[PDB]
Design an enzyme around this catalytic site. Sequence first.
Site, short mmCIF file in Angstrom:
data_model
loop_
_atom_site.label_atom_id
_atom_site.label_comp_id
_atom_site.label_asym_id
_atom_site.label_seq_id
_atom_site.Cartn_x
_atom_site.Cartn_y
_atom_site.Cartn_z
N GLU A 35 47.40 44.83 39.75
CA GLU A 35 46.08 44.67 39.13
C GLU A 35 45.70 45.88 38.29
O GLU A 35 45.16 45.73 37.19
CB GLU A 35 45.01 44.43 40.20
CG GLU A 35 45.11 43.09 40.91
CD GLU A 35 44.81 41.88 40.02
OE1 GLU A 35 44.47 42.04 38.82
OE2 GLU A 35 44.94 40.75 40.55
N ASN A 46 37.91 39.45 30.31
CA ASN A 46 38.47 38.10 30.41
C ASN A 46 38.00 37.22 29.27
O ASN A 46 37.00 37.52 28.62
CB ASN A 46 38.06 37.45 31.72
CG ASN A 46 38.48 38.25 32.91
OD1 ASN A 46 37.67 38.57 33.77
ND2 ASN A 46 39.76 38.59 32.97
N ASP A 48 36.54 34.43 29.29
CA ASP A 48 35.22 33.84 29.51
C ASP A 48 34.08 34.83 29.30
O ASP A 48 32.91 34.46 29.34
CB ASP A 48 35.14 33.16 30.90
CG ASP A 48 35.06 34.16 32.05
OD1 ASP A 48 35.34 35.36 31.84
OD2 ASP A 48 34.73 33.75 33.18
N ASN A 59 36.07 40.69 39.74
CA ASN A 59 35.54 40.03 38.56
C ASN A 59 34.02 39.81 38.56
O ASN A 59 33.47 39.31 39.54
CB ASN A 59 36.28 38.71 38.39
CG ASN A 59 35.86 37.97 37.17
OD1 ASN A 59 35.00 37.11 37.24
ND2 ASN A 59 36.44 38.30 36.04
N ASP A 101 36.73 34.15 51.25
CA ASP A 101 35.98 33.11 50.53
C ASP A 101 36.62 31.72 50.60
O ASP A 101 35.99 30.74 50.23
CB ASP A 101 35.79 33.53 49.06
CG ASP A 101 34.86 32.61 48.28
OD1 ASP A 101 33.65 32.59 48.60
OD2 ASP A 101 35.33 31.93 47.34
#
Length: 129
Positions: A35, A46, A48, A59, A101
């Site tokens: 990473e 990113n 988006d 993120n 999550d």
Amino acid sequence: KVFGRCELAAAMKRHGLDNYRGYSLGNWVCAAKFESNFNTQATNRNTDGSTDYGILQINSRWWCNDGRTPGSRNLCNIPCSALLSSDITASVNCAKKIVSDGNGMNAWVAWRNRCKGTDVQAWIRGCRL
Ligand SMILES: [Cl-]
Ligand SMILES: [Cl-]
Ligand SMILES: [Cl-]
């Protein structure tokens, strides 16, 4: 800060990441390697419009606030800048939430593509831990 491999392993262990949600320390070190190359100051934009921050490239779409990701959440309740500190506490605490999550470490696409299923123990081999 750019961590050494064993140095990061030790810091992650200190902060309770070793075997967290069943993921051995080598998994976490491997993820950080690909990473961020162990650099706490790593950032990446990113497609988006969100941004990934820190040693685990967390993120802004879901996990932290940077003030410039429309429609996003801040589930770790931190400014994204906290993820860039030489002190990995905020990154570790947030990573614990992320990995809990539902999809485990698959949340880190890099872990899935480069670490998952490999000899991740190699990442902590030789380390005094
Ligand atoms: Cl391991
Ligand atoms: Cl925002
Ligand atoms: Cl990848």
